Amino acid sequence: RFLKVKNWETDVVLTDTLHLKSTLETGCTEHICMGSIMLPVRTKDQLFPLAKEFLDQYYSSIKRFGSKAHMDRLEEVNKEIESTSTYQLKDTELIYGAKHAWRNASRCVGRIQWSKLQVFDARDCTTAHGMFNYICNHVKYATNKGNLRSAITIFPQRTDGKHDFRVWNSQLIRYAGYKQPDGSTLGDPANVQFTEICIQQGWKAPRGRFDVLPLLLQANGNDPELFQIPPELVLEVPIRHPKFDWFKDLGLKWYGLPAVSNMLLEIGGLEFSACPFSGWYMGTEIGVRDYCDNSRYNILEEVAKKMDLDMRKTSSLWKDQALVEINIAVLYSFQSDKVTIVDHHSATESFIKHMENEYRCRGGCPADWVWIVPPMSGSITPVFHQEMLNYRLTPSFEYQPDPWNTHVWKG
Amino acid sequence: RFLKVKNWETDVVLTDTLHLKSTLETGCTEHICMGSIMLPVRTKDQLFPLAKEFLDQYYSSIKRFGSKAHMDRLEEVNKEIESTSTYQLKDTELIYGAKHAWRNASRCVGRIQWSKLQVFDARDCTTAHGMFNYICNHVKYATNKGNLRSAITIFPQRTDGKHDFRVWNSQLIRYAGYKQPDGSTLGDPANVQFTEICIQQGWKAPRGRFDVLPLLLQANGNDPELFQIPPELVLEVPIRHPKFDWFKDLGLKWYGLPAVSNMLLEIGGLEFSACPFSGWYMGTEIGVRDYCDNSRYNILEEVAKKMDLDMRKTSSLWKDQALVEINIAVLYSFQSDKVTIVDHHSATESFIKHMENEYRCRGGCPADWVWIVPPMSGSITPVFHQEMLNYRLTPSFEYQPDPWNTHVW
Ligand code: HEM
Ligand code: HEM
Ligand SMILES: Cc1cc(N)nc(C[C@@H]2CNC[C@@H]2OCCNC[C@H](F)c2cccc(F)c2)c1
Ligand SMILES: Cc1cc(N)nc(C[C@@H]2CNC[C@@H]2OCCNC[C@H](F)c2cccc(F)c2)c1
Ligand SMILES: C[C@H](O)[C@H](O)[C@H]1CNc2nc(N)[nH]c(=O)c2N1
Ligand SMILES: C[C@H](O)[C@H](O)[C@H]1CNc2nc(N)[nH]c(=O)c2N1
Ligand SMILES: [Zn+2]
């Protein structure tokens, strides 16, 4: 079965055969589409098929499919599963798996970079202190003094689901948020609940607008532990504007390293519940979402006041004017400090080229249009005009619920 | 089977039950989502269930479900289908049907308006000249000297499908497009093909940049014929900027009346293949899409240059800057000439209100996020943060392929 996608700007038509390798469900049925819904313990029985499917993919990719090395590895895994109920990935397999999970991540606009990913194998980690050290090294390697390098650090897999490794932080680097008694928030309203957990865990909060949060790390199903990332490891960029000199006096800054730490990595049926990963920012992430979302730093009004825009009617497009200036500022600031960043025009153009390459060499590229299209200037980016098929390949990254809702506190 | 939608900005969660009445298929499966794909006669016994499903929802709406008068109409329609192979809607049923097709239109951000729709019943029409008359009357009514009113004009229903009424134009009012010896395109590059079909049929093109196209109208499955809309019925707006004096020098204008004319209206299993409808513009349609799309008028480069912005690197956001100014100019010009227009902020805020009314009054509101989120400044509009469920309810508007592909002459 063949599915076609058209680009409405170019009239380029692509053929997808890769969707035929899709296993998991989308959330959609032929009666309902859930494309804009954000969120639409395994047996040996379910595990060997999954291991086999993975090892089969790995071995075809190295062109060893059917080899003796191939057949011996199947049998080896087969026997490990029957005897220990699970199995361990070889290093080569883990690397290929982590890369492919990124490749398969349909909400990620940055995937042209997928084959360049530094994998750190932290499967020998046993404690939170060990996790802390591993994550420091990741941040230092990835930051590279502003010349950012993609990386992922992989902690031990789920066993009985009672001994999970987890990073409680949703990103390794983020700013505290403090709900004030007057109902206003200080710092990042997205992080209020987590900040409150940190405090109750004994964090001494500075109570400023940009306090870097402490890591909260769970090893082996244990209660999580607080660690402060060394400040000298946390690269930050004060935000200023090339034309407007009052921009700097808004007091804004952001961290250079976007590092997702709450996702679950699945390779060959195995589940890595702690697999923090990082690349670099696309500017709209900070300038549109982090700064201008109403429920985030929400700076639109203050920027527009300073700009003396006509604010009495939405139809002056004052919000849109201030939005563009803030985004110019973010890109200018990162560039001036030599911290890696990509603008949304460049990133989407690169994604379209990646997407076409993948169709030619792989028979497809699952993509989620809802997330790929930047949150400003959508239709002046080529991804707006590009039809996409969204489906699920493994290896994969999955959202998992925040651990404070699930953790069995040991005390 | 009962589904929740969350707004991530506000935390308001709504429960959808309306989807369990959905009938048509989406294109999505459990394995593949086609949410971003633009494009994902009836026999006697196909038509009766369709009529019944409609008449049931109609009688329920006027709170006479299961009433003597309900059962009597179901009977009358049954008799009429068995004997005539189709049936005729009562005026009341047609009006309700059309308002509901709009209400069910999951791609449409302006549905807060769905109940205020003037329906022109053109089912007595029989020639193309008649179609032209009807359409000028629609154009003049809806335009209302710039105080726009929503309207639809419904021509006769499909029969054996060898006698369709069709408006060949995709919209009642649009601009011609011609390829040049130089190789670029003059006017709207999206209408090049249609403009060639008009000249083929005898239109003498002014051969300018903003030439209102003629109507090509098809009555009763006949070869289509050409008519010019009276120039004085086409309200156009010169585009200027409130601060950039040079903007007017681009020589840009756009028409005030957006009027879609290639859709198929399906009510109670009957198919109205010529049903032009019109409301009023959200500014982004013109300013973002019509003017800035690369394969449309594609004017970004020229505006950016007149603004003296840094066009050397994508990261200066020159495109983004120019885009906003173009959209300020559309909105300002329409407002100055007192022609109804809505900005994307106000439109999307009204739609959130509409969603909330529909969830509580009707149990849901089908909505296609990919179309509903404006093509600029997406996440500063409230619809970006609103989860939506997309499903197909009937009565409905459905896209039709361009008829020059169908028709034989
Ligand atoms: C190297 C530069 C990269 C860029 C510019 C980039 C860009 C992005 C952006 C803009 C998003 C949407 C983010 C959001 O809106 O919250 C995203 C999502 C995502 N990316 Fe990337 N990405 C990069 C690297 C990576 C890496 C290194 C990985 C994994 C190894 C990754 C995996 C993911 C996943 C799993 C998502 C979905 C996240 C979620 O569901 O919350 N990306 N990417
Ligand atoms: C009253 C002012 C109205 C506003 C502001 C409005 C707004 C819009 C917008 C922005 C779109 C997306 C159009 C595009 O991107 O091409 C749209 C689509 C649509 N609307 Fe409306 N609308 C209005 C009136 C109407 C009326 C009166 C009807 C039917 C009687 C209607 C039915 C539809 C349908 C069927 C679509 C999808 C069309 C397609 O598939 O091309 N709308 N609406
Ligand atoms: C509910 C829910 C589900 C889901 N899958 N995900 C979320 C995180 C949201 C997505 N939108 C904001 C926030 O996630 C913010 C973090 N995203 C950073 C991005 F993925 C990125 C960029 C560059 C490099 C890199 F490694 C990573 C929430
Ligand atoms: C391939 C295809 C499928 C489909 N359903 N539709 C199309 C028309 C495209 C969609 N997007 C731009 C263009 O259609 C432009 C016409 N849109 C006008 C809009 F619906 C509107 C606004 C305000 C009032 C009103 F009555 C109508 C093409
Ligand atoms: C409801 C909707 O799915 C939600 O707001 C999505 C829309 N698109 C997005 N796109 C990206 N990249 N990141 C997001 O958080 C979201 N949020
Ligand atoms: C491929 C994608 O579906 C296509 O470009 C859509 C995206 N969203 C849209 N949204 C609206 N309102 N109108 C459109 O024409 C489109 N085009
Ligand atoms: Zn879908």
JSON list of C-alpha atoms in Angstrom, two decimals, chain B residues 31-170:
[
{"chain": "B", "resi": 31, "resn": "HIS", "atom": "CA", "xyz": [-1.96, 3.34, 12.35]},
{"chain": "B", "resi": 32, "resn": "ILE", "atom": "CA", "xyz": [-1.79, 6.64, 10.41]},
{"chain": "B", "resi": 33, "resn": "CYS", "atom": "CA", "xyz": [-2.89, 10.21, 10.98]},
{"chain": "B", "resi": 34, "resn": "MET", "atom": "CA", "xyz": [-3.82, 12.25, 7.87]},
{"chain": "B", "resi": 35, "resn": "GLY", "atom": "CA", "xyz": [-4.66, 15.42, 9.84]},
{"chain": "B", "resi": 36, "resn": "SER", "atom": "CA", "xyz": [-2.46, 17.45, 7.48]},
{"chain": "B", "resi": 37, "resn": "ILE", "atom": "CA", "xyz": [-3.67, 16.02, 4.13]},
{"chain": "B", "resi": 38, "resn": "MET", "atom": "CA", "xyz": [-5.73, 18.63, 2.27]},
{"chain": "B", "resi": 39, "resn": "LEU", "atom": "CA", "xyz": [-7.80, 15.90, 0.47]},
{"chain": "B", "resi": 40, "resn": "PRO", "atom": "CA", "xyz": [-7.82, 12.72, 2.73]},
{"chain": "B", "resi": 41, "resn": "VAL", "atom": "CA", "xyz": [-25.50, 9.10, -7.65]},
{"chain": "B", "resi": 42, "resn": "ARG", "atom": "CA", "xyz": [-27.38, 7.73, -4.57]},
{"chain": "B", "resi": 43, "resn": "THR", "atom": "CA", "xyz": [-29.77, 4.79, -4.98]},
{"chain": "B", "resi": 44, "resn": "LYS", "atom": "CA", "xyz": [-33.31, 4.76, -3.51]},
{"chain": "B", "resi": 45, "resn": "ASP", "atom": "CA", "xyz": [-32.28, 2.77, -0.41]},
{"chain": "B", "resi": 46, "resn": "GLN", "atom": "CA", "xyz": [-29.05, 4.71, 0.22]},
{"chain": "B", "resi": 47, "resn": "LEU", "atom": "CA", "xyz": [-31.13, 7.89, 0.33]},
{"chain": "B", "resi": 48, "resn": "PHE", "atom": "CA", "xyz": [-33.88, 6.93, 2.76]},
{"chain": "B", "resi": 49, "resn": "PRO", "atom": "CA", "xyz": [-31.62, 6.41, 5.83]},
{"chain": "B", "resi": 50, "resn": "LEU", "atom": "CA", "xyz": [-29.87, 9.68, 4.97]},
{"chain": "B", "resi": 51, "resn": "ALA", "atom": "CA", "xyz": [-33.21, 11.54, 4.76]},
{"chain": "B", "resi": 52, "resn": "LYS", "atom": "CA", "xyz": [-34.40, 9.90, 8.02]},
{"chain": "B", "resi": 53, "resn": "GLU", "atom": "CA", "xyz": [-31.21, 10.82, 9.92]},
{"chain": "B", "resi": 54, "resn": "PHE", "atom": "CA", "xyz": [-31.65, 14.43, 8.76]},
{"chain": "B", "resi": 55, "resn": "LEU", "atom": "CA", "xyz": [-35.41, 14.74, 9.37]},
{"chain": "B", "resi": 56, "resn": "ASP", "atom": "CA", "xyz": [-34.95, 13.24, 12.85]},
{"chain": "B", "resi": 57, "resn": "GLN", "atom": "CA", "xyz": [-32.36, 15.87, 13.72]},
{"chain": "B", "resi": 58, "resn": "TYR", "atom": "CA", "xyz": [-34.60, 18.58, 12.24]},
{"chain": "B", "resi": 59, "resn": "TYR", "atom": "CA", "xyz": [-37.72, 17.61, 14.26]},
{"chain": "B", "resi": 60, "resn": "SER", "atom": "CA", "xyz": [-35.66, 17.26, 17.38]},
{"chain": "B", "resi": 61, "resn": "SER", "atom": "CA", "xyz": [-34.33, 20.82, 16.78]},
{"chain": "B", "resi": 62, "resn": "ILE", "atom": "CA", "xyz": [-37.89, 22.32, 16.67]},
{"chain": "B", "resi": 63, "resn": "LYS", "atom": "CA", "xyz": [-38.76, 20.08, 19.68]},
{"chain": "B", "resi": 64, "resn": "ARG", "atom": "CA", "xyz": [-41.36, 17.96, 17.89]},
{"chain": "B", "resi": 65, "resn": "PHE", "atom": "CA", "xyz": [-39.37, 14.72, 17.79]},
{"chain": "B", "resi": 66, "resn": "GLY", "atom": "CA", "xyz": [-41.65, 11.68, 17.46]},
{"chain": "B", "resi": 67, "resn": "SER", "atom": "CA", "xyz": [-44.64, 13.98, 16.94]},
{"chain": "B", "resi": 68, "resn": "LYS", "atom": "CA", "xyz": [-47.53, 13.32, 14.58]},
{"chain": "B", "resi": 69, "resn": "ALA", "atom": "CA", "xyz": [-46.04, 16.01, 12.21]},
{"chain": "B", "resi": 70, "resn": "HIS", "atom": "CA", "xyz": [-42.58, 14.37, 12.40]},
{"chain": "B", "resi": 71, "resn": "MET", "atom": "CA", "xyz": [-43.89, 10.87, 11.49]},
{"chain": "B", "resi": 72, "resn": "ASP", "atom": "CA", "xyz": [-46.12, 12.38, 8.78]},
{"chain": "B", "resi": 73, "resn": "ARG", "atom": "CA", "xyz": [-43.12, 14.03, 7.00]},
{"chain": "B", "resi": 74, "resn": "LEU", "atom": "CA", "xyz": [-40.98, 10.87, 7.28]},
{"chain": "B", "resi": 75, "resn": "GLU", "atom": "CA", "xyz": [-43.89, 9.04, 5.65]},
{"chain": "B", "resi": 76, "resn": "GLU", "atom": "CA", "xyz": [-44.29, 11.71, 2.92]},
{"chain": "B", "resi": 77, "resn": "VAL", "atom": "CA", "xyz": [-40.54, 11.62, 2.11]},
{"chain": "B", "resi": 78, "resn": "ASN", "atom": "CA", "xyz": [-40.47, 7.82, 2.09]},
{"chain": "B", "resi": 79, "resn": "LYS", "atom": "CA", "xyz": [-43.37, 7.79, -0.37]},
{"chain": "B", "resi": 80, "resn": "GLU", "atom": "CA", "xyz": [-41.64, 10.43, -2.49]},
{"chain": "B", "resi": 81, "resn": "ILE", "atom": "CA", "xyz": [-38.31, 8.55, -2.67]},
{"chain": "B", "resi": 82, "resn": "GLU", "atom": "CA", "xyz": [-39.87, 5.14, -3.49]},
{"chain": "B", "resi": 83, "resn": "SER", "atom": "CA", "xyz": [-41.82, 6.80, -6.32]},
{"chain": "B", "resi": 84, "resn": "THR", "atom": "CA", "xyz": [-39.61, 9.66, -7.60]},
{"chain": "B", "resi": 85, "resn": "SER", "atom": "CA", "xyz": [-36.12, 8.31, -6.63]},
{"chain": "B", "resi": 86, "resn": "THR", "atom": "CA", "xyz": [-35.35, 11.59, -4.81]},
{"chain": "B", "resi": 87, "resn": "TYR", "atom": "CA", "xyz": [-37.24, 14.16, -2.73]},
{"chain": "B", "resi": 88, "resn": "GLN", "atom": "CA", "xyz": [-37.64, 17.88, -2.12]},
{"chain": "B", "resi": 89, "resn": "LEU", "atom": "CA", "xyz": [-36.80, 19.72, 1.07]},
{"chain": "B", "resi": 90, "resn": "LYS", "atom": "CA", "xyz": [-39.28, 22.12, 2.65]},
{"chain": "B", "resi": 91, "resn": "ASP", "atom": "CA", "xyz": [-38.03, 25.72, 2.85]},
{"chain": "B", "resi": 92, "resn": "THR", "atom": "CA", "xyz": [-37.69, 25.29, 6.62]},
{"chain": "B", "resi": 93, "resn": "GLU", "atom": "CA", "xyz": [-35.59, 22.13, 6.13]},
{"chain": "B", "resi": 94, "resn": "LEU", "atom": "CA", "xyz": [-33.33, 23.76, 3.51]},
{"chain": "B", "resi": 95, "resn": "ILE", "atom": "CA", "xyz": [-32.67, 26.78, 5.78]},
{"chain": "B", "resi": 96, "resn": "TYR", "atom": "CA", "xyz": [-31.90, 24.64, 8.84]},
{"chain": "B", "resi": 97, "resn": "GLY", "atom": "CA", "xyz": [-29.79, 22.31, 6.60]},
{"chain": "B", "resi": 98, "resn": "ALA", "atom": "CA", "xyz": [-27.62, 25.12, 5.28]},
{"chain": "B", "resi": 99, "resn": "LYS", "atom": "CA", "xyz": [-27.14, 26.75, 8.62]},
{"chain": "B", "resi": 100, "resn": "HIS", "atom": "CA", "xyz": [-26.06, 23.36, 9.99]},
{"chain": "B", "resi": 101, "resn": "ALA", "atom": "CA", "xyz": [-23.67, 22.58, 7.16]},
{"chain": "B", "resi": 102, "resn": "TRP", "atom": "CA", "xyz": [-21.82, 25.75, 8.26]},
{"chain": "B", "resi": 103, "resn": "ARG", "atom": "CA", "xyz": [-22.15, 24.83, 11.90]},
{"chain": "B", "resi": 104, "resn": "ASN", "atom": "CA", "xyz": [-20.56, 21.44, 11.10]},
{"chain": "B", "resi": 105, "resn": "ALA", "atom": "CA", "xyz": [-17.75, 22.99, 9.03]},
{"chain": "B", "resi": 106, "resn": "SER", "atom": "CA", "xyz": [-14.75, 21.91, 11.08]},
{"chain": "B", "resi": 107, "resn": "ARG", "atom": "CA", "xyz": [-12.28, 24.03, 9.14]},
{"chain": "B", "resi": 108, "resn": "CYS", "atom": "CA", "xyz": [-14.17, 27.27, 9.73]},
{"chain": "B", "resi": 109, "resn": "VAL", "atom": "CA", "xyz": [-13.06, 29.69, 12.43]},
{"chain": "B", "resi": 110, "resn": "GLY", "atom": "CA", "xyz": [-16.04, 32.03, 12.06]},
{"chain": "B", "resi": 111, "resn": "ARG", "atom": "CA", "xyz": [-18.79, 29.67, 13.14]},
{"chain": "B", "resi": 112, "resn": "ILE", "atom": "CA", "xyz": [-19.86, 31.80, 16.06]},
{"chain": "B", "resi": 113, "resn": "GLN", "atom": "CA", "xyz": [-21.94, 33.37, 13.26]},
{"chain": "B", "resi": 114, "resn": "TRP", "atom": "CA", "xyz": [-23.49, 30.13, 11.97]},
{"chain": "B", "resi": 115, "resn": "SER", "atom": "CA", "xyz": [-27.12, 30.96, 12.94]},
{"chain": "B", "resi": 116, "resn": "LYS", "atom": "CA", "xyz": [-27.12, 34.34, 11.14]},
{"chain": "B", "resi": 117, "resn": "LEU", "atom": "CA", "xyz": [-27.10, 33.18, 7.53]},
{"chain": "B", "resi": 118, "resn": "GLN", "atom": "CA", "xyz": [-29.40, 34.53, 4.86]},
{"chain": "B", "resi": 119, "resn": "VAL", "atom": "CA", "xyz": [-30.37, 31.57, 2.61]},
{"chain": "B", "resi": 120, "resn": "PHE", "atom": "CA", "xyz": [-31.34, 32.34, -0.99]},
{"chain": "B", "resi": 121, "resn": "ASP", "atom": "CA", "xyz": [-33.42, 29.52, -2.40]},
{"chain": "B", "resi": 122, "resn": "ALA", "atom": "CA", "xyz": [-32.45, 29.31, -6.08]},
{"chain": "B", "resi": 123, "resn": "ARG", "atom": "CA", "xyz": [-33.95, 25.86, -6.63]},
{"chain": "B", "resi": 124, "resn": "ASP", "atom": "CA", "xyz": [-36.38, 27.26, -9.24]},
{"chain": "B", "resi": 125, "resn": "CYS", "atom": "CA", "xyz": [-33.41, 28.31, -11.43]},
{"chain": "B", "resi": 126, "resn": "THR", "atom": "CA", "xyz": [-33.02, 26.61, -14.91]},
{"chain": "B", "resi": 127, "resn": "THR", "atom": "CA", "xyz": [-30.45, 28.47, -17.06]},
{"chain": "B", "resi": 128, "resn": "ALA", "atom": "CA", "xyz": [-27.04, 30.02, -16.65]},
{"chain": "B", "resi": 129, "resn": "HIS", "atom": "CA", "xyz": [-28.43, 33.49, -17.21]},
{"chain": "B", "resi": 130, "resn": "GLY", "atom": "CA", "xyz": [-30.74, 32.80, -14.21]},
{"chain": "B", "resi": 131, "resn": "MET", "atom": "CA", "xyz": [-27.71, 31.67, -12.18]},
{"chain": "B", "resi": 132, "resn": "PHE", "atom": "CA", "xyz": [-25.99, 34.94, -13.06]},
{"chain": "B", "resi": 133, "resn": "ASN", "atom": "CA", "xyz": [-28.96, 36.97, -11.86]},
{"chain": "B", "resi": 134, "resn": "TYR", "atom": "CA", "xyz": [-29.17, 35.05, -8.59]},
{"chain": "B", "resi": 135, "resn": "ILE", "atom": "CA", "xyz": [-25.42, 35.50, -8.04]},
{"chain": "B", "resi": 136, "resn": "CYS", "atom": "CA", "xyz": [-25.40, 39.26, -8.63]},
{"chain": "B", "resi": 137, "resn": "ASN", "atom": "CA", "xyz": [-28.25, 39.52, -6.16]},
{"chain": "B", "resi": 138, "resn": "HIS", "atom": "CA", "xyz": [-26.24, 37.46, -3.67]},
{"chain": "B", "resi": 139, "resn": "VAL", "atom": "CA", "xyz": [-23.13, 39.57, -4.32]},
{"chain": "B", "resi": 140, "resn": "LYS", "atom": "CA", "xyz": [-25.05, 42.86, -3.79]},
{"chain": "B", "resi": 141, "resn": "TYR", "atom": "CA", "xyz": [-26.98, 41.58, -0.72]},
{"chain": "B", "resi": 142, "resn": "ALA", "atom": "CA", "xyz": [-23.92, 40.16, 1.06]},
{"chain": "B", "resi": 143, "resn": "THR", "atom": "CA", "xyz": [-21.68, 43.19, 0.19]},
{"chain": "B", "resi": 144, "resn": "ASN", "atom": "CA", "xyz": [-24.27, 45.73, 1.56]},
{"chain": "B", "resi": 145, "resn": "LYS", "atom": "CA", "xyz": [-21.94, 48.63, 0.69]},
{"chain": "B", "resi": 146, "resn": "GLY", "atom": "CA", "xyz": [-19.22, 47.20, 2.95]},
{"chain": "B", "resi": 147, "resn": "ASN", "atom": "CA", "xyz": [-21.37, 46.17, 5.92]},
{"chain": "B", "resi": 148, "resn": "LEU", "atom": "CA", "xyz": [-21.11, 42.50, 5.01]},
{"chain": "B", "resi": 149, "resn": "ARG", "atom": "CA", "xyz": [-23.83, 39.96, 5.65]},
{"chain": "B", "resi": 150, "resn": "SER", "atom": "CA", "xyz": [-23.41, 36.17, 5.47]},
{"chain": "B", "resi": 151, "resn": "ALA", "atom": "CA", "xyz": [-25.36, 34.44, 2.76]},
{"chain": "B", "resi": 152, "resn": "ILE", "atom": "CA", "xyz": [-25.66, 31.32, 0.62]},
{"chain": "B", "resi": 153, "resn": "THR", "atom": "CA", "xyz": [-27.45, 30.78, -2.68]},
{"chain": "B", "resi": 154, "resn": "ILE", "atom": "CA", "xyz": [-28.65, 27.24, -3.31]},
{"chain": "B", "resi": 155, "resn": "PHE", "atom": "CA", "xyz": [-29.20, 26.07, -6.85]},
{"chain": "B", "resi": 156, "resn": "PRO", "atom": "CA", "xyz": [-31.10, 22.90, -7.85]},
{"chain": "B", "resi": 157, "resn": "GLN", "atom": "CA", "xyz": [-30.02, 19.53, -6.34]},
{"chain": "B", "resi": 158, "resn": "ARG", "atom": "CA", "xyz": [-28.22, 16.78, -8.26]},
{"chain": "B", "resi": 159, "resn": "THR", "atom": "CA", "xyz": [-30.51, 14.33, -10.07]},
{"chain": "B", "resi": 160, "resn": "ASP", "atom": "CA", "xyz": [-28.84, 11.65, -12.24]},
{"chain": "B", "resi": 161, "resn": "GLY", "atom": "CA", "xyz": [-25.61, 13.64, -12.08]},
{"chain": "B", "resi": 162, "resn": "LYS", "atom": "CA", "xyz": [-25.52, 14.28, -15.84]},
{"chain": "B", "resi": 163, "resn": "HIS", "atom": "CA", "xyz": [-27.37, 17.55, -15.21]},
{"chain": "B", "resi": 164, "resn": "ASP", "atom": "CA", "xyz": [-25.37, 19.31, -12.42]},
{"chain": "B", "resi": 165, "resn": "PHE", "atom": "CA", "xyz": [-25.47, 22.98, -11.62]},
{"chain": "B", "resi": 166, "resn": "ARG", "atom": "CA", "xyz": [-21.89, 24.09, -11.10]},
{"chain": "B", "resi": 167, "resn": "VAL", "atom": "CA", "xyz": [-20.13, 27.41, -10.59]},
{"chain": "B", "resi": 168, "resn": "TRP", "atom": "CA", "xyz": [-16.86, 26.81, -12.33]},
{"chain": "B", "resi": 169, "resn": "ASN", "atom": "CA", "xyz": [-15.03, 29.55, -10.38]},
{"chain": "B", "resi": 170, "resn": "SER", "atom": "CA", "xyz": [-13.55, 28.45, -7.01]}
]
